[PDB]
Structure formats: C-alpha cells, structure tokens
C-alpha cells in the first residue's frame, strides 16, 4: 500500500575540488557521524569513626596552660560506580579517481520526505571538465513513492504504544486505587485512539478497574485513566497529521496542559508523566 | 516445529548517493554499534592519628599572650579499586563500487518479528540508474517462518527460570523459616508455571519446607513460597501472550502489587525481590 | 526554478611542493575537520548522618580537664552522570604522484555563494613544470547557477518554522492565559510571514485563543502572540534579504528590542525567548 | 584583475638523507599539523539542607558535661557540562624511493607573499648524487601573479564587515538611545569606509537613529555611532596598506585609543568593543 | 645572491644492524618527532547563598540545653574552560631490504650550518658487506652554498620586526603620552636599525609624537621611544653577527640592562617589554 | 682527520626462534623506543568576595536565642594552563621469512665507542640450521675509524659553549657590577679554555668590565668572571680526557666546589649556576 | 676469547593449535612486551591574601546583635608540572600458514645462560601432523659458546664503575674534608678492585686527598674513601662469582653492613649510598 510524495532536499555541506594538473588524483572522503551515550550511576557509602581526646590544664596549673589535643579517625568508604556506554558510528568513505582538468563536486543535501516525516542524507558527487557553469543545488525536490505500513483507523484498531528511546511499551498498573500508565516490557497492553472534536483520546482495553478507560493528566502530572467525559484533560494532541500509520513516531501533547506532553520520568510509583517541556517520542504499532 | 509469522520492518535511517560523474566510485560504509559496561567497586580505609599540643600563657604573663599551637597528623589511607569492564562491538562494513550515473540507496529498517518478540537490523542497499521514481520503504511487511523451540505446557512442564542479564538461575533457599527465591548458579532447581483465572503461578518442585510451593510477594518486597490459595499476591503476569516456549524472555509482574515485578536486587539475605518499577527479563528454559 | 549568481572564493590555506629530483614522488594530503559536542548532566544526592558526642570534665574534676570528643558520620552519596557525545568528522585525502621537475600546488579557497548564503570548500590542485610564473589565487569569482526551492510569498504562504540546532519546530502553547511560542516536535503548527513598512510579522494560523495571532516580545523576554497593531514589539527583522525561500536559514531580530532575537533557552513554562545577544538560526520550510 | 608580486620564502625546517648503500630505500615523510579547540561551559547548582541538633548538659548535671551533637545534611547537586570540540588536521605524506648513492634533501620554506599578506608552506624535495656542493635555500624569492578580488573604493563602496574567528557579520543595534555595533548573522547591514587626513572612518548606511552614522569608541570601550566630526575617536587605523580589496583581513585600531582595536568581547548588551590589547581580524567583503 | 659556507654535522644517534643469515631482511625505521602545545584558559564564577538558623535554649530551660542548628546553602557555579591545542608531528619512515651478510648502518647527525644559524637533520644510511672496518662519523664537515635573502643595510633600510612565536609584528602605540612598542597584526609600522660604537638602535619611522624615534628600555621594563642621545638604554645587542639579512631571527638584548631582552609579556597597556631572562626571537623582514 | 678506535659492544637483550616445522614462517619484530617530555605551567587567580551577616537575640529575648546566620560568597577564579608536549619515537621493524628447520637469533648489543664517548644500538640477526652450537655474543669488540671534528687547542682556540638540553649558548651579562654567565641565544659570545696544573679555566673574550675574564664559582653558587689568579674556584674539571674536539659534550665540575658543576637553573637575575649535584651537559663548538 | 657454557631454558608459556579441517589456516601471533616509565616533578606555589572585616553590635545595641562579617580573599597559585615519559616496546609477530590436519605448537622458554647471567626468550614453533605423541619441553638444556669480553684481573686493572639505570659513572668528590663517591658523567675517574680473604675492596686511583683510597660505608650510610686497613666496612661482596669480566653487571654488598649495598639515592651533598635493601646494578667496564 504505497503512496506518492514530494521529497525536498535542502543543502547542508558542499565541497569542490578542481584538479588542473596533467596527472590524475585519487581522492578519499570519509564522512563519520558518531553518537556515544554513557549512563553512570555511582553509589558511595562513607563511614567515619573519630575519637578525639583533649587534656587541658589552665586554671590549677596557673601560669599559662598546656592543652594536648589527641585525635583519631578511621574512615571506611565504599564506592561503586556503574557506567553503561552505548556508542553508534556511521563512517562513509568514497574513493574516486578524479581525471586531469576535471573538477569533482560533492553536494551533501539533507532530504526531508514530506508527510511521513522521514529524512535521509542525500549526497551528490559530480565529476565534470573545466571551466564550466557551476550548478549548486540549494534545494532539490524529488517525487518519491513511500511504501507505507497499515493505516490506523481511529476507533476499531488495537495499537500498542512504545517509547522510542527506551524501547519499552506503555502498560497499565494500579497507582493508588486508580489505573495509571507506566512503561513496561509487556506487549499484552493495547490501546485504541479515538478522535472527537476536542482532540485525541487514548483509551485502554486492558484495565484493572472497570469503566476507568480513557487516559488523562492529573494536577500533579502523572497519567491515570478515567471514564469518557467532555473533559479537555483526557484529550491529547498528536504531532503528525492524519491518518496515523504503522511505526509512526508521535508526541502526545495534553489539550488542557498545553505545555506538557506524555513522557518518561523517574517518579515515585509511576514513570509515565505529563511534565512541562517534555515531548517524548512514542512509536505506536498495530497488533496482528 | 516451525510457525509462520508476519514480520514488519519500520524505517530507522536512510542514505542516498547520486553519482553523476563519468568515473565510477568505490564506497565503504561502516556501521558500528558498541556497548561497554564497566562495574567498579572501590573500598577505601583511611586512618588518621593526630597529636595536637598548644602551650598558652595569657593570665599570668599579663600583657597579652603567646599561644603556641603545635600539631602533628599521620594519615595512613589504603584504597582498593576493582573495575570490571565488559565491551561488545559490532562493526558492519559494506564496500560497493557505484557505477557512473547510478544512485546508491541504503535503507536501514529495524525488522520486528511478531509473536516471538524477536528483532533484527534489515538493511536494503540498491544501485539503480538516474533519474528515476525513488521508492522509500517506510514500513516493509515480510512473511517469515520462525523455527521455534519446544512449547511449555502450563502444568506438567518442568522449567528452570534464568535471569537474562546475570545468567544466574532462580533457586530456592530458606530465609527466616520460609522458602525464598534467590539467584544462583544451580540448575537443579525447577519450576512449573500454572494458570488460573486470576493469573500465572510459579510453583516449585524442589522446596525445603513441604507444602510451601507457590511463589508470592511479601509486604516488604522479597519473594517467598506459600501454599496454594486464592490470594492475588501469589499470582503473576507474563509479558508474552500464550503459549510460552523455550528460550522465552518474560517479565513476571505481580497481580496484587501491579507496579512491582520479579527482579534482581542486592538485599540482605535474599536477592530476588518484587520491587516497584522493576521489570527484569527472565529467560525460562525447559529441562531434558 | 534555478537562478544565476556570482560566487566568490577567498583564500584560506595554500601549499606548494617543488619536486626537483629525478625520481617521482607519491604524495598524500589528508585534510580532517571534526566537530565533537558532548552534553553531560550529572545529578548527585549526598546524605550524611553524623552523631557527635563529647564528654568533658573541667569544673568538678578541678585540676585541668579531660574532654573526650567521640564522633561518627555515615555519608551515603548517589551520583548519576549522563553524557551524550555526538561527533562528526570529514577526512579528505588526495593521493597524487608528482612527476620529476614538477611543482604541485594546492590552494584551499572558501567559496562563499552570494544571495543564497551558501559556502563550500574549493580546493585547487595544480601540477606544472618548473621554473614558472606562480599564479596564486587570492580571490576567485565564479558564475554559478543555484537550483533553488519554492519562493515564500509573504502573506498567503503557510510556512512551519524549525530550529536549526535542535531540529524542533516552533509550536504554540498557552502560557498564563496567552498563546506563546515553544519548541516542539509537532509539524501541525504553521505560520505566515507578513511584511509592513515597520518590519516582519510572524502570524500564527493555529492559535488557542482567537484573535491573538501575531508574535511579539514581552518586557520579560518570552514570546507571546497578540492582535495586529502598529506596535514595533510584534515586528521582526530577518537576516536574509527578500525574497525568502524554502530551506532558508533566518534569524528573527526584534525591532523594538534591537539587541534581542528569537531563540531557544531553558526558561520556566516557555522555551522560545527573545534574549539579548541571541541570534538563533531558524530554518523555515513550506507546507505541501 | 591579477597583479604581479614578489613572493619571499624564508627557511623553516630542513632534512637530508644521504643513502650510500648499494640497495635503494623507500622513504615516507608525514608532516602533520593539527589544531584542536574545545569550548566547555559547565553550569553547576548545588543545594544543601543541613539539620544540626546538639543536646548539652554541663551546669545542672554538675560534674562535667555530656554534649551530644547530632547532625544531618542532604546535599543535592546538579552539574551540566557542555563541551564543543572542533579539530582540524592536515597530514602531508610523501613516499619517495631514493636511489643508491643519492642524497635526498627536503627544505621546508614558509613562503610569505608580499602586499596581499598571504602565506603558504613551500617544500623543496631534491634527489641528487653524492658527493656534491650542497645548496641550502635560506631565503628564496619568487615572482608570483596574484589573482585578486574587486578593489574597495573608499567612499562609494558598500562593504559588509565580518569577524574572522566567529564568522559573524557586524550589525547595528540600539544600545541606550544610541546606535551601536554588535556581531550578528545578518548580512543586511552594510558599511562604507571613508579616508580623511586623520584616518579611516567606518560609516553605516543602515542606522536606526538618523544622522548618527560614523563609528566611534566611547570612554567605556563599547562601539557606538555618531555624526561626522573632526574627532579622532571616530577615526580608525587599518593594518593593510591601500588599496583595500575583497576578502581582505584587517584590524581596525582606534586613533585616539591607540592601544585598543575593534574586537569581540562578551559585554552586557553590546559585544563589539574597543578594548586594550585586542586586534581582532575582520574579513571585509563587498556586496553584489 | 648565494654565499659559500662551512656546514658542520655533529653526531646525535646511531644504529647498526648486522644481518648474518642466508635470508634477506626487510627493515622499516620510523623516526617520529612531535610537538604539541595546549593553551587552556578557564574562567569560573561560583556564587553561594547560605541561610543558617540556630535555635538554642540553655539559660532559661535550665538543665542543659538543646541547640538546633538548621542551615541551608544554594551554590550556583558556572565554569568556562577554553583549550587551544596545536600539534605538529614529523614522522620519517625508511623501508630498506638488507641483503644477506651485509650490515646496515644509520648515523643521525645534526647538521648545523655556520653563519646563517640554520640547522637540519642529516641521516646517513649505509649498507655494506661484513666484516669490515667500521667508519663512524662523529663530526662531518660539508661545504654548502646558502642561497641568501636581501642584505639589510644598517641605516637606509626599512625593516618590519616580527615576533617568531606569535607571528605578530612590532607596532607603535601611545602609552601615557609616550610612543611605546606593542605587538600587533599591522604591517604598516616600519623600523630602521642603526649602528653606533655603543650598539644597535631601533629607530621608528611611523611615530605618533614627533622626535621620539629611537627605542629604549625604561626603569619599569616597558619599551618606549625617545630622541637620539648617547644613552646606553636606547642601544641594543643583536645575537647574529653582521651583516643582518632577510628572514633573520634575532634577539635584541639591552646594553644598559644586560640581562633583559626585547620580548613579549602580558603587561597592562603595553605587551612588548625588556624583562630579565627573556630572549624572545624576532624575525626581521624587509619591505618591498 | 679520522682516528682509529676500539669499539666494544656489551649485550642488552637477546631473542631466539627455533622454527622446527615443515612450513616457513614470516616474522616481524618491532623495537619501539619513545621519549615524551611535557612541561606545563598553570597560573591560577582566585578572587572571593564573601558577605556574612548574623542576626542573634539571646540576652533580651530571654528564653533561649534565635541566631540567624545569613551568608553570601561570590568566587571568581581564572585558571590558565599551558602545556608544551615534545615527543620523539624510534620504531625499528624487521620482517624476515625464517626457513624450515632453521633458528633465527637476534642479539641486541649496545655498542659503546671508546674515547669519543659515542654509543649505538648494534643488532645481530642470524638465521642458521638446527641443531648447532649456539654462539651468544656477551661482549663484542670491533675496531672502528671515527671521522672526527677539528681539535680544540687549549689556548688560541675561540669556542662558544652551548647547553645540550636547552640549545642555548653561554653568554656574558652584568650581574651586580660583575660579569656573569647566563644562557642566551646569542652566538657572539666566545670562550677560550686554558689548562694550568690546577685545572681548566674558562676565559671570556667578550666581557663588559675589562680584566674580569676567567670564570669562577661564588660562595652563593652563581657564575661570575674574575681576573687570572691561583684560586681553585676559577678552575674547572672536564669529564672527557684531552684532547677536546668539535661537538664535544662536556661537564665542567668546579675544583674547589668538587660536588657542584656548571649548570642551568632558574635563579634571580642569573641562570647559569654551580649547584651541588648538577652535571649539565655542555656541547662546545668552534668558531669559523 | 670465547668460552663454552651450559644454557638452560625453563618453560614460560605454551600454545597449541590443532587444525583438523580440510582448509588450511593463516595464523598470526603477536607477542608484545612494553615498558613505560614516567617521572613527573610538579612544583606549586600558592599565595593567598585574605582581608576579613566583621562589624558587630551586641552590648550597646541591646536587644540582640547584628554581626556583619565581610571577607575577601585573592589566591594566586602557580603550578609547574614536568613529566618525562620514556617507553620501550618489543612486538614480535609470526605469520604461519598451518596446513590441514596439522597441529601447530609454540613453546615459549626463557633461556637463562649459566655463568655470564645472560637470559633470552627462546620460542619453539613446530608444525606436525595429527594425531601424534606430543613432546612438551619443560626444561631444555643447550650447550652454548659465549663470546666474552676482556677479563678483569683483580689488582692491576683500571675499571670505571657505571650505574646501569642512570648511565652515570662513579666519581670521587670531597664531602666534608673526606673523599666520597658520587654519580657523575665523567669517565676520568677509575677504580681497581682488590680481593683479600675478607672480601672485595674498591680502591680509587684519582683521589683528592692523598692516602684515602679504599671505599667504605659510614655509620650514616654514605660512601667515603679511607686508607687500607683490616676493617670489614671497606670490604664489599660481588654478586657474580670470579672471574669478573667486561660489561659485567654487579651489586656491591657491604661486608659489615650485610643488608646494605652500594646504590643511588637523592641525599644531601652525596648521591652514592649504602642503604638497607638496596642492590643497585653497577655495570663495570675496563679502560683502553
């Protein structure tokens, strides 16, 4: 089920090499791009035992005083660091033999695909004789055909929500005596996105307490589930325009709490919050 | 005993290279992905001995005072750091000679297999002439055939539980005068998963105290074994839908304590707890 | 829709190699240029419990005093560093065999394209016999043809604003009871640039409160939206001369607050400010 | 519009290799030159809460005293480092097979071009038989032909000033109720250099307040714009002798404040100052 | 305008390799020499706000005392490191196949050229059969022909002085109401070296105050310009014997202040001093 | 003017490889030897401003006391590190194909040449069949022919003294009202070594004060010049036996102060001292 | 003057590789052994100037007190680190193609030569078919022929003593009014080893005070020279059995002070001591 689309590729970085000499030139251009995230968690437990003892004689031994301050201190400290480095590089080398009196031109464009919100690095290497009218592509526009996943029909489509950075699915647990959203490795928990005039409602199918089905943000910040109402707190706002599709990255922004968005945070007894300035990317996928 | 399945591969990262020049181009793309975990445990023992002695004369030697504060301090400190670095990389290089007036297109998809919860990196390299209608695959869906292990029949199947990160099996030991779960290298300890209307019950076969067979979470957090009851504390919730199979990664989430899950933690005299926000991955395997 | 333009390339770095010997020489020149940005965020929580106890006897036990100061201190500290290294290199090697009694000359120019504000590294390698009249290019001027994107018609063109460094779009949220600009991953929010005699007005289409449409800077610094007036606070100044085009990097400088410019900053409940000495680069793109 | 010039190349570093043996020798000489600039900006926020409580009994409980000093301290510190490494290397390898009974001689000269103030590394490799009269070039003088940019006619030439290190153009903003120079990404701001008997005057075309056109240094240090007068404060001194040309690196030194020069500095509400011992390099370029 | 000269090359480092076996041996000797200079400049701004409050009750609440010392401290510190690494390596590899029953001998001499004060690394590789009378060159003397720059005629030669390490020319500015020497990027400032019976006088041509022409050292240390006198303070001593030539590295040592020499130092409002134990190398060059 | 000499090479390190198999073996042995000296000089300037204010009420507000200790502290610290790394490596690789049933034997000897005090690494690689009587060379003695520089005739030979580590010549300056030795870049200063029955006298030719010609050590440690006397303080002791030659490394040890030797040290207003336990190597060279 | 000897090579490390497959296998085994010694010497000079001023009003301003404690502190610290890294590696690679159904066996023995106290790494690589009776060499004994230096005749042989680690010869200087041993670069100082019934006596030839010739250890520890006596303090004990030879590494252990040995140590005014637990290796060599 593919769809046509207008891709646009804006410039990023160019490079030209005008070989004028009689000899040819071998040329190698390596573009490296590398992320490296490290998450350390040191716990330290220091324990000191100090025994001070001062012997002083000023009043009775009149003429002056001798104050002998002995002191001892045994300090036992136990540290325990725990790093977790994760790194990802992408080297891209291109070896080209540039002929004599030919200029080589690399144009690195960043091709952003419309609709789908996909982007890809679009290099353009040319080798042509000199002198000539140089054609620098500031913005290229290509007509692409995206092969696309199954469309999510809002209402009557069971989709499981997944956090993109964590790779942990959205689950339902009982905080207080209320159903509440939490990140978890379980794929059993499913959701159904609904659309009213107000906005998007995330309804659960697997809920502990019966009736309490539609997700909403509390005054505190945490996510709980309530009954279907006309409350703007239980509505949400999706970043991508309809229709929603398989493997679609979205960011649920609360309608009442306009600033805040559905996100991960290390809270007490719940870890899916609607905090101010938090637009966490949720990949949503469909069940078989 | 293989089974059919719908694999789906969502986009991750793309890359295009439009060679337009008369000369061909050799191209090398190295994708590195490397984890590195380091676990240090420093113990430090400092020991100071300080001998202060102050001689003061203000009262008797009237006009002012001379206060001579001598002091000494011998500090013997012994440190003992112990790191344990473990690193795992996976470099993936692809050398390709791109012909003249041909574009090369790499599409990196992340192929998530349905049911089994397996995922794999699915690269798609193409080399085709220009200009042409570009076909960007946002979501590919493939029909795969998983060769699958032996199915776990809930009741009448002896399975030993194993912690995925630690590679240590679940064992039974006597905490207080109660059988309790602990991580250990022994494979002799076996379990039988049962399913009632409430949820999943982890029953032991090798227990110290007779009768106390089914796993349950205490008010404290630690795991103990009790008799068969209608208590939701002794039920559990598995992340993968049935049927359970060999080499299946699961996360046992307590039914009463909805937030907490069966997990590893450095506690006193037991190291398998049901702590809040802890979904530790247990690979469960079948005995021969 | 391409346009002609005068490119100018000013000198950066030169290099000459006069091989005079009878034997030829293989020559390899690697130009590396590498950025590496690292963003750590350590949170530390130290917790000390100290129990001092001093036993002193000076008054009653007359002749001097024995002051025995015992003390204890248990210090539990938990650190949690989180780095996020991102690095980008660009190595450029050129292997050339220089013949006998020939000089090789590399001239590295930095070719700045006019109008479009694009720049690219322009190397010039020559190989010629010796001795000869050396031709050093301080400033080359080339006539280029920029392939350019769709032109933004000021008024009647829906453009979404995007922060260049963050790759986050400009969005509208309700700060206080006022519509206010914020960075966000949502592409649904669109803007229309207007031009009066005073300057450039950024009007929103998707606003929460009706009427409050045109962006303006407050006395505090934060960006809010107001009605259309003759106020210089709601005007702005764009760095590139007209016409504005697709994928155009701009810097909106407030007309009233001449120093300040539309920018990202970690504020409370809004993150798009007009702070003094802040010229953040906004790529603006057109909707399909 | 090229011009002739006398290039002079003074010695830097030599190297000789006298192969005397019957076998030839392959020789590889790599000259690396690498800059690496790193700009970190750590912000740290420590927050301690300490609750000391001491219970003492000396007066009433007569014979001595027991002073029990309990104390607590919770220290929450949040660090946030942000490095920005930028590195640039230039490796230059030359592989040469030196024949038997031939000496190889590399002479590295630093060729400084006259007038234009351009410099380039000028290597001289020779391979010749032995023994012979060695010709060491301490100072070579070459006649070059610089291809030069468009000449700046002082008065009636609109030139935009650009900071070389920052790559940020000179702009005009309103500090106090006075037009003042600031660095900015806007290319709209233009200047016209004038020459009187006193010195060089930097006049603006785009000024906020009408009349206040010519740049001058204040008693504080900051740059403002005033009317045309016979004041030496508004004159300047350019490092390169006339005529000024496209892509010309200059350093504007104030005539009154002889020590100080037009430069970048992080001041409050203006960032282009005339500070003592500051000769910042301004590339000045011409408008199309 | 070349001149003959006696080069002398004293030993540095030798190496011999006596291959005695029937098989030949490939041999690679890499001599690396690498400088790396790093110049960091960290600025740190710490700001603490601490609110201590102690509540004590000893006098009225008679029997002992409870002293409850609460305390708070918010410490905001901003660091800003700025390194500037510059590195220069020179690897020199020589691959040689040593034949059977032949010894290879490398002798590294450091060839210091007379008069001109130029030096160069002079390797001597030999390959000869064994056994033989070994000829170790402790000191070689070669007759070279230096190609030399234009001679500086003392009086009637305009030369601009340049600091070798900084690559900044000597300039004249007004410190107090006196002309004073400073480092600067301007090449407009010229000097004329004069020679009397006493020593060398550095006269300026471009001076602010008329008459004050000849350089001299003050009692403080800084360099100013005075009228022509018989004062030894305004004389100087050059390290190289006459005649002075183009691209000549010199060190101006004051005649009165025999220890001190013309040098760079970060002083207030002047940066060219005559400090004790400072022999900074000034390259002096001639104007076209 | 070459001279014969007995070289002796004592053992350092051996290595044997007995290939017994039917297949041959390629073998590569890399001997690396690398020095790396780093000279950092950090200057730090911390500046604190602290404003404490305590409000206390105990006497008047009778029953106890409230002591509110507010405090503030602004700490501005500026650091400025400056490293200067210099590194020198010498890798020596030897690739050899060892034939079947042949042993390869490397013997690394350190060949110390007599008289001249030159040393060089003397490797001996052999390849021979097995089994055989192994010939291990503990001490080899070779007859070499040193090509030697011009001999220094003690008296009537102008030689300039040079510090080996610093590469700075010995110069004469006026400390107090006395001529004194200092390190400097000037080659104009010359010396003449004289030999009496007592020892070696370093006489200057270029001296400021007439008569004060012969070098001597003071009671303080610094080097000054005095008239010719029978004082042992002005005599010296050279490490190499006569005759002295060009490029000869010597260590001048004072005859009176037997422990101390002529050396470099950072003193006030003189930097050539005769300190205890200081045998700095002076290369002495002859003038043309 | 060679001598026969029994070499013995004890096992160190083995390695076997049994290739059983039909395809051959290329195999590369790199043994690296690398020493790296770094000797830093940081000198730091901190200088604080602190101006505290407290204004207090409690007595007169009755009801409580305001105590305003202002304070200032300017801390100027200058650090100066100086590392001196010296590293030496020895990589040893052996590339071998192991044929099908052949096992490769490396046995690394450490061959210690008798008498001479020389040792060398003795590898044994074998390649043979499988299966076979494996012959593991725990201890090999080879008959070698050491080519040996000139024998030292105890009495009537002038030998100069040299410290192995420092490469500095033993010299004589006047500590107090006594001749004393010191390390120095001078080769003029010679010694003659004598042997009595008691032990070895190190006699000097070049001594300052006449008569005081034979080396002995003081009660302090330092080495001085005395007349010939029957004192065990002036005797010594050599580690190698007679006869002593050229380039012989020895350790002189005092006969009276049995624990202590002739060694280097940074003492005041002498640097050759006889300290407890110090067996410094002295290479002793013969004069020509």
Numbering used by the authors:
A (entry chain A), B (entry chain B), C (entry chain I), D (entry chain H), E (entry chain G), F (entry chain F), ...: 10 to 297
The authors write:
Here we report the structure of lysenin in its nonameric membrane-inserted form determined by single particle cryo-EM, to 3.1 Å resolution. No other oligomeric species were identified during the 2D and 3D classification steps, indicating that lysenin pores are almost exclusively nonameric. Thus, each of the nine monomers in the membrane-inserted state can be divided into three domains: the N-terminal cap domain (Glu10–Ser33 and Pro108–Ile156), the β-hairpin domain (Val34–Ile107) and the C-terminal receptor-binding domain (Val157–Gly297). In contrast to the α-haemolysin family where the β-barrel begins close to the membrane-spanning region, the long β-barrel in lysenin spans the length of the assembly. The membrane-spanning region, measuring ∼35 Å, is clearly visible in filtered maps as a detergent-bound shell that delineates the boundaries of the lipid bilayer and is lined on the outside by hydrophobic residues, such as Phe, Tyr, Val and Ile. Two aromatic rings, one formed by Phe70 and the other by Tyr79 lie on the intracellular and extracellular sides of the transmembrane region, respectively. The lumen of the β-barrel is lined with charged and polar residues, including 12 threonine and 9 serine residues. Hinging on the flexible coil between Val157 and Arg159 (spheres), the N-terminal cap domain swivels downwards by ∼20 Å and rotates inwards towards the central lumen by ∼35°. The pore structure of lysenin reveals that the β-barrel recruits polypeptide from both the amphipathic loop and the two β-strands that feed into it, from here onwards referred to as the pre-insertion strands.
